Amino acid sequence: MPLVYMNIIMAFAIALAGLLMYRSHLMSSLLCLEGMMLSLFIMSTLIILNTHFTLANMMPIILLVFAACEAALGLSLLVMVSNTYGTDYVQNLNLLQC
């Protein structure tokens, strides 16, 4: 396992950790999710190209498409949340408590 794959997985772990920190700005949560899918795309593309799995060249595009669709949904949700409060701050969603 070369160092490039390790760097990509480290990048994904950093994006996931930053998503889990939640300083503020749920928009940053969506940004972290998109960084995660970008790292997934890059490493999956590198693995597939390297092993010459010709039919697997389908998979990255599919992934991209689906992930981007998810982003759209998320953005819509964000707007409505903002549409209630005027700002996308995380701490505004304190109505529901365990």
Binding site: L33, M36, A56, G74, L77, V81, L93, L95, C98
Partner: protein, 347 residues
């Protein structure tokens, strides 16, 4: 929304689950999960209010993170073995990340935090769908890759789920949070037998789904979401309160009720594998679920709470919409213990 749109979204949710269940390719499983996630969001927001929007966005965030972890596990598995078929996981912690993603999808501890919030935010029908249908696909994947799981991690998260559900149900006055913690504890019971017997997992899933359907339909019929709001049901529909109390006793695992069948079997199975301490601890912890079920039963039908004057008008009207499957659900969740050996049908 438009009934045609609602029907299309429900069919899309079910088609995503079926695509997960019938496919042998990891990418198709991920696509089915994506389809289910996409079609589930409007269902949680049928009744538009800030609470439902907050619940939907929390659910979307958790499920999207779970899907990303699932894809990373799939890609690492492909890296260490050029395989896409759903089989033995072929690798170290790639399996750990797969288990974490499936646990977040199911709501197992320590990823349980979103279930009570999403259940409280959404209505009762959305909560019914969320707590019943959304468990089939991740449990199917876990049953498929059960021989790969590390028993230590799975058993740890199962015991954590049971403990957290038992403790968190004690503090609730809202009925939806009670149902959410019950779901967490039941999933904990389900996943503790996956390393040993997947048939027992499926049996527990069937029994739990029947009991949850009966409970949610009874809660919808007597439209109460709070303990005190439920305490007013006896003055109109005492038979509903009696059926609800019997169902709650069944969900507590009391013999000879139906809810005793899974735990019993599970305990039995775990004793075949030279495991005693965990079954003992699981029973002693499910005692807490029984305690808060019994408190709800006290507040529901065993005592008569004060009523209000306007209640008299409700005496003059009858429910226009009637649920056809409610009678069957109650009987199946109450009186199917003698048919226990039928579990050999590999349900």
């Amino acid at each position: 929304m438009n009934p045609i749109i609602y029907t299309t979204l429900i069919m899309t949710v079910m088609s995503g689950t079926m695509l997960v269940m019938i496919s042998s390719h990891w990418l198709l499983i991920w696509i089915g999960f994506e389809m289910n996630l996409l079609a589930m969001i409007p269902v949680l927001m049928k009744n538009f209010n800030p609470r439902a929007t907050e619940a939907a966005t929390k659910y979307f965030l958790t499920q999207a993170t779970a899907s990303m972890m699932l894809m990373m596990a799939i890609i690492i598995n492909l890296l260490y073995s050029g395989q896409w078929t759903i089989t033995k996981m072929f690798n170290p912690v790639a399996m750990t990340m797969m288990t974490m993603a499936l646990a977040m999808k199911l709501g197992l501890s320590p990823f349980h935090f979103w279930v009570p919030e999403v259940t409280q935010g959404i209505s009762l029908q959305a909560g019914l769908l969320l707590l019943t249908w959304q468990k089939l696909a991740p449990l199917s994947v876990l049953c498929q890759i059960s021989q790969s799981i590390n028993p230590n991690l799975m058993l740890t998260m199962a015991m954590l789920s049971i403990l957290i559900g038992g403790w968190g149900g004690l503090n609730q006055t809202q009925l939806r949070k009670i149902m959410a913690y019950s779901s967490i504890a039941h999933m904990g019971w389900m996943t503790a037998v996956l390393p040993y017997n997947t048939t027992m997992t499926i049996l527990n899933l069937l029994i739990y789904i029947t009991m949850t359907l009966a409970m949610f339909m009874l809660l919808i019929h007597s439209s109460a979401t709070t303990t005190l709001s439920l305490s007013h049901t006896w003055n109109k529909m005492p038979v509903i309160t009696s059926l609800m109390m019997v169902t709650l006793l069944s969900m507590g695992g009391l013999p000879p009720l139906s809810g005793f069948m899974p735990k019993w079997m599970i305990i039995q199975e775990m004793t075949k594998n030279e495991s005693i301490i965990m079954p003992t601890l699981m029973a002693m912890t499910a005692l807490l679920n029984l305690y808060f079920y019994m408190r709800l039963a006290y507040s529901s039908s065993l005592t008569m709470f004060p009523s209000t004057n306007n209640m008299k008008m409700k005496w003059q009207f009858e429910h226009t919409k009637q649920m056809k499957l409610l009678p069957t659900m109650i009987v199946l969740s109450t009186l199917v213990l003698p048919m226990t050996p039928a579990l050999s049908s590999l349900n």
